Design an enzyme around this catalytic site. Structure first.
Site, PDB file in Angstrom:
ATOM      1  N   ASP A  75       4.012   0.932  10.417  1.00  0.00           N
ATOM      2  CA  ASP A  75       2.717   1.144   9.807  1.00  0.00           C
ATOM      3  C   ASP A  75       1.873   2.118  10.637  1.00  0.00           C
ATOM      4  O   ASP A  75       2.308   2.579  11.702  1.00  0.00           O
ATOM      5  CB  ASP A  75       2.001  -0.224   9.685  1.00  0.00           C
ATOM      6  CG  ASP A  75       1.264  -0.763  10.882  1.00  0.00           C
ATOM      7  OD1 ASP A  75       1.601  -0.380  12.031  1.00  0.00           O
ATOM      8  OD2 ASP A  75       0.278  -1.475  10.676  1.00  0.00           O
ATOM      9  N   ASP A  97      -3.354  -0.205   8.404  1.00  0.00           N
ATOM     10  CA  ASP A  97      -4.366  -1.187   8.786  1.00  0.00           C
ATOM     11  C   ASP A  97      -5.594  -0.486   9.280  1.00  0.00           C
ATOM     12  O   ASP A  97      -5.487   0.419  10.105  1.00  0.00           O
ATOM     13  CB  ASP A  97      -3.881  -2.171   9.846  1.00  0.00           C
ATOM     14  CG  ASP A  97      -2.676  -2.967   9.457  1.00  0.00           C
ATOM     15  OD1 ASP A  97      -2.513  -3.246   8.261  1.00  0.00           O
ATOM     16  OD2 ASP A  97      -1.917  -3.334  10.343  1.00  0.00           O
ATOM     17  N   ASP A 133      -2.116   2.316  12.140  1.00  0.00           N
ATOM     18  CA  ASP A 133      -3.330   1.555  12.412  1.00  0.00           C
ATOM     19  C   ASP A 133      -4.444   2.443  12.864  1.00  0.00           C
ATOM     20  O   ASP A 133      -4.199   3.373  13.624  1.00  0.00           O
ATOM     21  CB  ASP A 133      -3.080   0.482  13.503  1.00  0.00           C
ATOM     22  CG  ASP A 133      -1.873  -0.391  13.293  1.00  0.00           C
ATOM     23  OD1 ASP A 133      -1.923  -1.248  12.411  1.00  0.00           O
ATOM     24  OD2 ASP A 133      -0.906  -0.259  14.081  1.00  0.00           O
TER      25      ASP A 133
HETATM   26 MN   LIG Z   1       1.354  -0.689  14.143  1.00  0.00          MN
HETATM   27 MN   LIG Z   2      -0.607  -2.750  11.904  1.00  0.00          MN
END
Ligand SMILES: [Mn+2]
Ligand SMILES: [Mn+2]
Ligand code: NA
Length: 356
Positions: free
Chosen positions: A195, A281, A197
């Site tokens: 992911d 995120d 962030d």
């Molecule tokens: Mn991450």
């Molecule tokens: Mn994350």
DNA sequence: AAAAA
């Protein structure tokens, strides 16, 4: 003399001991699944210290003076030196419960409890879970299954940068003075990640403006047809509370998203459906706590655990993602940068790429 | 329950 604390070590991405640490990370993960927190911790600390070495272990004599290497860990290192393999990690990789837990929790929205439930129902494959007509799935799991192949495919740096541009463009539309920082693995120099962030902060935004930004940015993306999944966790932040003693989520407003990343936005060397689903995120924090939040969200997970452990046991200080409190001076310590947090703790500054 | 560094 190598410290027992990751926050007193420099750990860079050139790991010379991957043969040992991959085996130790598998054994640690299995102990997590088997609810053996103690054995999990011992393997994590051993793996962490070997990751910091500037040379590969090639004999048992090379382990002399290295902390966090108990008798169980040294038997595992010895076995790998013997024939290049870990018989213990090989047995975990072939264990049916371990294989099922790894496979099931690889789905966004599936944790330890749901993985255990499906295993005890007799499920072993994701195909059999998805096609089952009696199972009921949460909205998070539906998105986890729909975008599974994209989410198990690593994000690379051109993709992370393309996401950064999208985040910055959306955020400055509503808060033009906002500071957006890419945190997590990519900030530590990683070439790939699961992911992307980000930490968002604004020096002039009000308490209400700070609260509304993630709602405005995600509604904007929803209108653009880019929001594939969205879950916003409201802040439970307390300005004057002591930092946490727990070893858990921070209290800042945050959102767990899946965004539609068009291939045209990615500036890579390699430039299907023409888009990729990306886990993103976003964390919003008050301006004065930006250094604490940045430090907590940069990681790695082990670096954070040792930072907090060092602060408590060596300095009688309480550190978390929101603040630093000195129990002897009975005062909260302020910081405008990560460097100031390290200086308050009596630690040499560790660069983000040295926190792996 | 699960989403996190
Ligand atoms: Mn991450
Ligand atoms: Mn994350
Ligand atoms: Na999962």
């Amino acid at each position: 003399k190598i410290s027992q604390y990751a926050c007193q070590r420099r750990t860079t991405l050139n790991n010379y001991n991957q043969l040992f640490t991959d085996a130790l990370d598998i054994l640690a993960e299995n102990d997590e699944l088997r609810e053996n927190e103690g054995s999990c911790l011992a393997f994590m600390r051993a793996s962490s210290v070997l990751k910091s070495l500037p040379f590969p272990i090639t004999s048992m004599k090379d382990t002399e003076g290295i902390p966090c290497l108990g008798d169980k860990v040294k038997s595992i290192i010895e076995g790998i030196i013997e024939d290049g393999e870990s018989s213990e990690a090989k047995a975990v990789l072939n264990d049916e419960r371990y294989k099922s837990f790894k496979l099931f929790t690889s789905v966004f929205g599936v944790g330890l409890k749901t993985a255990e439930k499906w295993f005890r129902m007799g499920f072993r494959t994701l195909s059999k879970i998805q096609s089952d007509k009696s199972l009921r799935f949460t909205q998070m799991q539906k998105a986890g299954f729909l975008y599974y192949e994209d989410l198990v495919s690593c994000v690379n740096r051109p993709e992370a940068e393309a996401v950064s541009m999208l985040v910055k463009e959306a955020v400055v539309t509503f808060l033009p003075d906002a500071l957006v920082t890419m945190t997590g693995g990519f900030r530590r120099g990683k070439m790939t990640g699961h992911d992307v962030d980000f930490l968002i902060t604004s020096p002039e935004a009000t308490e209400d403006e700070e609260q509304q930004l993630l709602h405005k940015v995600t509604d904007f993306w929803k209108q653009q047809g880019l929001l594939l999944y969205c879950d916003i966790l409201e802040s439970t932040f307390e300005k004057f509370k002591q930092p946490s003693r727990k070893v858990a989520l921070d209290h800042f407003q945050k959102c767990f998203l899946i965004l539609k990343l068009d291939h045209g936005r990615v500036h890579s060397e390699k430039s299907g459906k023409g888009w990729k689903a990306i886990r993103v995120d976003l964390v919003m924090c008050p301006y004065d706590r930006r250094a604490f939040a940045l430090l907590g969200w940069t990681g790695s997970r082990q670096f954070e655990r040792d930072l907090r452990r060092y602060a408590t046991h060596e300095r009688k200080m309480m550190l978390d993602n929101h603040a630093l409190y000195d129990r002897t001076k009975r005062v909260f310590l302020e910081a405008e940068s990560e460097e100031e947090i390290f200086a308050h703790l009596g630690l040499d500054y560790i660069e983000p790429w040295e926190r792996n």
